[PDB]
Amino acid sequence: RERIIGIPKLEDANDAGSKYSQECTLILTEGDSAKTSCLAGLSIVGRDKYGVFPLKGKLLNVRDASFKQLMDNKEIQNIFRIMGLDITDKNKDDIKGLRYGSLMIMTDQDYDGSHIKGLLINMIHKFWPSLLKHKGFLSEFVTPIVKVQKGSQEYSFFTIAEYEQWKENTNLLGWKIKYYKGLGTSTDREFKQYFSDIKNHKIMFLWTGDRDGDSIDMAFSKKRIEDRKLWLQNFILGSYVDHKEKDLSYYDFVNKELIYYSRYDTERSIPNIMDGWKPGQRKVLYGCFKRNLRNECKVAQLVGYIAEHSAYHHGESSLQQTIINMAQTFVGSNNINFLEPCGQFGSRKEGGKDASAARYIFTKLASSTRSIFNEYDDPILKYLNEEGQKIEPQYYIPVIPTILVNGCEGIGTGYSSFIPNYNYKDIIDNIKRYINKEPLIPMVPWYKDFKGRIESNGKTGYETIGIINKIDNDTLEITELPIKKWTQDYKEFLEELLTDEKHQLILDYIDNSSHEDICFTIKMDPAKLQKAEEEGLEKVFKLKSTLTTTNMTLFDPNLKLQRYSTELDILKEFCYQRLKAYENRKSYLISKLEKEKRIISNKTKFILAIVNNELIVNKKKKKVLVEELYRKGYDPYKDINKEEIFEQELEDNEEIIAGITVKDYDYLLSMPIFSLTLEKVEDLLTQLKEKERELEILRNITVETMWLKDIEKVEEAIEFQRNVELSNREE
Amino acid sequence: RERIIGIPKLEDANDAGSKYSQECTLILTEGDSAKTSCLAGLSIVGRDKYGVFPLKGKLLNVRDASFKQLMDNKEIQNIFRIMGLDITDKNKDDIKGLRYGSLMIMTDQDYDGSHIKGLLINMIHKFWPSLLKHKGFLSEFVTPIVKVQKGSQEYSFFTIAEYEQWKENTNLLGWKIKYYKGLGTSTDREFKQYFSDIKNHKIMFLWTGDRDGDSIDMAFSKKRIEDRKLWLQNFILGSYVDHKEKDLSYYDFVNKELIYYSRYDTERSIPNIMDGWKPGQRKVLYGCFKRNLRNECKVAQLVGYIAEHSAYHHGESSLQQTIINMAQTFVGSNNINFLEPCGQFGSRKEGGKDASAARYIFTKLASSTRSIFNEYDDPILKYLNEEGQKIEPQYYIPVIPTILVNGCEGIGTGYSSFIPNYNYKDIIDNIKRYINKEPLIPMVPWYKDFKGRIESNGKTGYETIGIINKIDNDTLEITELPIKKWTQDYKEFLEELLTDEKHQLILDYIDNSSHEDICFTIKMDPAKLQKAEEEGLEKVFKLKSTLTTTNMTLFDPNLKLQRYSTELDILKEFCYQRLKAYENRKSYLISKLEKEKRIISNKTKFILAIVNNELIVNKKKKKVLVEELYRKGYDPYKDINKEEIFEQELEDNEEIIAGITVKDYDYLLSMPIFSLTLEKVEDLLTQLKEKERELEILRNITVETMWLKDIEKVEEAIEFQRNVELSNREE
């Protein structure tokens, strides 16, 4: 019968290309690993009707692709041969005589997998749009998103929303919980179970009109970019596909699933207004806070720790670089570095490219970082949950808007952003003006250790100018470059001036620039030098750069991309949010202090009672003592301990009365015998007075006073960090 | 004056190529990062006399290189132009008129850096051997290996041996300690200090005769491989270069420093006899034990943890693969996997290549692993120290020789090894024969779940044969492949049989092989099939593979490469070492039990005394109570706590009398008030009787009984793990 010659990776169904072709299904998998799991499944269902072909990487986007790219693309050519399909016959509306009568796409339940499903739908729509309208033609393999276990009574949830509804309404015992985003997570045995019940692991794509086609073209066409921008902007942040449904329209897949891939690159490339962090940097800072990185560690070790605790998925090279960039201090990088560069982290010579290997450089939190990112704020942030692990928050809320301090430069596709560096002092006096209802003052971009000029160009932004001086009639000297022109690039530019392709503008140059200062000495024809002076030396030698302020694009506090017209608009939004964050911090601290006070009060009573011989513990049966603590009015811990739940963060519990266990009083019984000694008793007594004074003071403090006080600490910390940098610089 | 045109990365000295050329030094650095640090140094010394050029990666080995490779090599051509040197003039004995009069090599103080220094010396010796004899021509930049601090009194050690001598003779307070292997570890400020005192950061290479040249040629020549093998074998394991010396001969550099790079690849590629582990796998197992990986975690998270805690430096891709390979269970991989494959870890189809992404697969210690690698052995192993961090041991000592269970295949250059898999049951009965002075029985290679035949080839080893059957006169069926012939490769081979380049041996084939079983059905010309039967079907269809036993090469227990003639020689050496390890474990456990008993005895006395009203703690001043505990005969902890020191593992301490502090008795004072309750007192009393019985039993047990008992547990664990694999396999 019919057979395929040139495709070793194909696991052709026995009946493909036969008179049973309509009954056959071809499974397209994301990778060879998925194909191997699929063959484990097919050892159940059999190999007569199911074929398997592994997709490598990501399918070509046929919609934008040139004809030559299409012919040259072996993976797509192979898929065409395997199906029995080809381009010349479009308009085909029937499933005969194809080698297979159905196509099933099997991928990870993640953004890349969704992008792959979309690319396959894109190809089918582009070449045989008729085929999508044909019912039962395209399906997708689906496994449960979450599996839970308690002894017996095992549940499997297809939808996260379903799992959340179960989780909210259940005490997680001891329930064991596993997420199944990737196909690799499933064992071969589990694949056998899915294929044993394949109907319940299959979702059929449904065509619901021309909007489906318009959706696919909007997603993948080179000409629909603005429609795509509108589509991304109008996205509803709760949107998700309901896997409980046996059917899924193409329009719903594109709008409620593919969109997550489509918007992911913008999410990676553009920082949030609130902390100025892109998500990867935020993962790094979160990792540093979690371990409390106050002492040096190797960057490579930090890379391993962040990869484990922050769920960073873009590889060690990007992670290394992200940490390094967060530690750089050279001209044109960070105004305030939040990681310390303990070693060679690169320089202005190559714009940080000249950083040393991660294995030998150390880093730690910079001395100012915990004042700026005040730890009292940590508990009021919203932390993301990935497959049950508690990872980095949606954003940090620093005391000052760090986004203005260090700026940003981002390019994804379809969105970019640039924000200049600014003086933290100008930022702080704008904050004080915001607190006092005083008019805000526009800020001029400012760069630490830059010696040149920054001035408005009057239209789109600002210009930075380096320093060049006439030494004598033959000689020029350059002692400063414009912002972000690295020394090595400039040196190459002077060398190209030496060659005739640039008309021998200069006779000679000596470069004695250091790692951080600029020293070029240039020799010229005296007449050429004079003419260059008339043209303007800065222009001739290209010593100006432009800081454009017309595209200050950030994610807003509600996770929505915005363009801010000026630095003041950014500052105002930040101030409104930050002032609210101070109200949340105050309420949280009050609730925490009340809980601490109650715990102290119980310990004080317990210790005094033993020490005054009112309470006898020696040789007392434990249940008798717990009963006595309960009867005498001691709070079991659960009454004081009134909190989002992250799955991976999870003398008997036999109820004495009424609901009390021994563990309920561990916070008292656990206290060391040393607590009964005199100094310890005295300190314990001291503790409650101090706790109530601290609570009373907190109750009456305003948010403006809390902020103003933190700003005071931030100014001191920044100045100390800077003074240390200067002291280190001096001989 | 003279100047260089085509080399942007060059930082030419101002006086290079001038009449001052002899006074100039050219610094060759390992990378751009090193060059940037060097310019930080030169901002002190000035730029008139020092030039800097960054080496990229590793210099070409000119000795083996073809002429075309030499001409084509821009980095070397550039170095020649910068120096003013070139090939045509060999025999040059003078330093004029070179652009620079001295060459200084600046690298990391690690194996790769040493290899780079060697490559540069190799080039100079090959083209201008005369130049090496010229004194002061080649030097090397050296920083202190270790810097220590206590307040003031900062010391810097150039030699590790010097640092060890200081460390042994000093209490590390509170001393802060940093290693400086890589150049990147040093700040720009530190570089300024080294260049402020450059004479004390420079070592001059010295030529001491023709042995130096012979040393360099032996190290780098294509024709001296056997001399290199002898050189590697005769290495003295304490060997090191004395950096205290201002001079270093080429022969001493090659023999005592370069050799570490030279032998490193063999160290990476060939396992130790004792645990069957290559160092990277051993780092993985060590990491798993340290966190006690009894619950599943993502492989990518495990990768991050191992990278932090085991000092793995070969990148995430290799680390991922190492973990995955340690979890594989398919035919031809591990007889006993010590990591569990919780997900898709690959199959026989592609020999494990078809493993899923690290982000979505989970692993944990396999159920048998802690019985085989008995944790009681952990404290008696020798753990390596890297830059103050405690990492993986020299080797583990398992209960059985795992190297025979899972075999190995290693290729470095100049050494390779192959060991087949063996049946653990055969291994265990050989161990019991070793214990009883009974003759050992030769073992035949055995592979879990393999259905074919394994038989001696009579000469070099064994042969494994797959299964092929005649179905009828036109049809053959293959239901088993030989060991390590992956299904996909074999399928490609059948497809090539279909084509005329292989004379149309077969008409057709169907492949319904699963992820783990083999099913090829083949259609043939009946006459061709008969002729093939006469030739022998196994031979025609290539269903045999060879297990060669003539190159069983391992590191011996003393860290020295050996070739073992048979599996019995390996077994005997392992048994001798393991029996000694049991003596060390017994002595360690006895010492630990004696310490635990003493601690219990003190707690028992302390609790009874309080509970019986002999000792009063309530409202007693702490120093008074500590004085009373000391006077009444309680042991301060330091008297019971009698231990190699790893740097990164580091009510007042005011001496009451005579040398006692409050902390000395924390182990008593720390005990919870709950210890005074009745059940807790009763259990405490129980604890000492149990501790002395356990100690008495341990004192009189023989090593053979301890081993035999552990072997019993190992047999149970392996059988349980296997039964779970089989139960999972069943429908």
A335: CATH: 3.90.199.10
Q: How far is B602 from chain A (nearest CA, A)?
A: 15
Are B401 and B477 in the same domain?
Answer: no
Structure token pair of residue A146: 């979450």
Structure token pair of residue A21: 């072709």
User: Are B182 and A359 an interchain contact pair (Cβ–Cβ within 8 Å)?
Assistant: yes
How far apart are alpha carbons A668 and A651 in whole angstroms?
13
Interface residue A509 vs chain B (CB under 8 A): no
Are A306 and A354 in the same domain?
Answer: yes
Chain B (403-442) residues lying within 8 Å, Cβ to Cβ, of chain A: none
Task: Pick A36's closest partner by Cβ from B108, B344, B729.
Answer: B344
Q: How far is A513 from chain B (nearest CA, A)?
A: 8
State the amino acid at position B180 in one-letter form: Y
Per the residue annotation, which of A305, A360, A395, A630 is the catalytic one? A360
User: Are B618 and A676 an interchain contact pair (Cβ–Cβ within 8 Å)?
Assistant: yes
Are B462 and B413 in the same domain?
Answer: no
Structure token pair of residue A609: 């009672």
User: Are B356 and A678 an interchain contact pair (Cβ–Cβ within 8 Å)?
Assistant: no
Per the residue annotation, which of B111, B194, B264, B360 is the catalytic one? B360
Q: Chain B interface, mutation test: which of A14, A192, A360, most B Cβ atoms within 10 Å? A: A360
Enumerate the residues of chain A whose CB falls inside 8 A of the CB of residue B346.
33, 36
User: Are A301 and B316 an interchain contact pair (Cβ–Cβ within 8 Å)?
Assistant: no
Interface residue A182 vs chain B (CB under 8 A): yes
DSSP code, position A21: G
Are B382 and B518 in the same domain?
Answer: no
Are B272 and B414 in the same domain?
Answer: yes
User: Are A33 and B678 an interchain contact pair (Cβ–Cβ within 8 Å)?
Assistant: no
Interface residue A367 vs chain B (CB under 8 A): no
Q: How far is B409 from chain A (nearest CA, A)?
A: 24
How far apart are alpha carbons B101 and B118 in whole angstroms?
20
Beta-ladder partners of B416: B411
- Measured CA to CA in angstroms, residue A654 lies from A445, A660, A663, A668, B302 at distances of 66, 8, 9, 18, 37
DSSP H helices, A407-515, are 424-435, 487-498
User: Are A186 and B344 an interchain contact pair (Cβ–Cβ within 8 Å)?
Assistant: yes
A360 is annotated as an active-site residue: yes
How far apart are alpha carbons B185 and A296 in whole angstroms?
11
Interface residue B493 vs chain A (CB under 8 A): no
Deposited experimental method: X-ray
Which has the closest alpha carbon to B10: B52, B68, B39?
B52
Residue whose tokens read 């005498």: A632
Task: Pick A354's closest partner by Cβ from B36, B300, B495.
Answer: B36
C-alpha torsion angle, residues A109, A110, A116, A118 (rounded to 10): 90
The chain B residue lying nearest A340, using CA atoms, is: B187
3-state secondary structure of A563: strand
Q: How far is A13 from chain B (nearest CA, A)?
A: 9
For B253-270, what is the HEC assignment? HHHHHHHHHHHHHHHHHC
State the amino acid at position A121 in one-letter form: I
Interface residue B617 vs chain A (CB under 8 A): yes
**Backbone φ, ψ for residue A330 (5° rounding):** -70, 160
Strands in B430-497 per DSSP E? 453-456, 461-465, 467-470, 475-480
User: Are B316 and A316 an interchain contact pair (Cβ–Cβ within 8 Å)?
Assistant: yes
CB B46 within 8 A of CB B15: no
Task: Pick A677's closest partner by Cβ from B3, B622, B670.
Answer: B622
Which has the closest alpha carbon to A260: A65, A76, A108, A103?
A108
- Measured CA to CA in angstroms, residue B82 lies from A621, B5, B76, B347 at distances of 87, 10, 10, 54
Chain B (326-355) residues lying within 8 Å, Cβ to Cβ, of chain A: 341-344, 346-347, 349-350, 353-355
How far apart are alpha carbons A70 and A55 in whole angstroms?
16
A581 alpha carbon, distance to own chain's centre: 21
CB A176 within 8 A of CB A146: no
How far apart are alpha carbons A158 and B723 in whole angstroms?
31
Give the angle A104-A106-A109 at the CA atoms, nearest 5°. Answer: 135
User: Are A622 and B679 an interchain contact pair (Cβ–Cβ within 8 Å)?
Assistant: yes
Range of the domain at A350: 268-419
Are B365 and B415 in the same domain?
Answer: yes
Enumerate the residues of chain A whose CB falls inside 8 A of the CB of residue B674.
622, 651, 666, 669-670
What is the CATH number for B473? 3.30.1360.40
Are A460 and A323 in the same domain?
Answer: no
User: Are B188 and A344 an interchain contact pair (Cβ–Cβ within 8 Å)?
Assistant: yes
Are B484 and B407 in the same domain?
Answer: no
Cα diameter, chain A:
104
Beta-ladder partners of A11: A52
A717 alpha carbon, distance to own chain's centre: 27
Interface residue A37 vs chain B (CB under 8 A): yes
Interface residue B530 vs chain A (CB under 8 A): no
Strands in B442-549 per DSSP E? 453-456, 461-465, 467-470, 475-480, 508-511, 520-523, 544-548
Are B393 and B491 in the same domain?
Answer: no
Are B411 and B518 in the same domain?
Answer: no
**Per-position b or e across B21-44, b if 16+ CB within 10 A of its CB:** beebbbbbbbbbbbbbbbbbbbbb
Are B537 and B414 in the same domain?
Answer: no
What is the per-residue DSSP string for A583-633?
A: HHHHHHHHHHHHHHHHHHHHHHHHHHHHHTTSS--TT--HHHHHHHHHHTT
Beta-ladder partners of A146: A157, A179
Query: Dihedral of CA A637/A639/A641/A644: which sign?
Result: positive
User: Are A491 and B8 an interchain contact pair (Cβ–Cβ within 8 Å)?
Assistant: yes
Interface size, chain A vs chain B, as Cβ–Cβ contacts under 8 Å:
285
Angle at which helix B567-611 crosses helix B703-729, to 10 degrees, equals 100
Are A460 and A391 in the same domain?
Answer: no
Enumerate the residues of chain B whose CB falls inside 8 A of the CB of residue A651.
674, 679-680
Q: Please tell me what resolution, in angstroms, this structure has.
A: 2.3
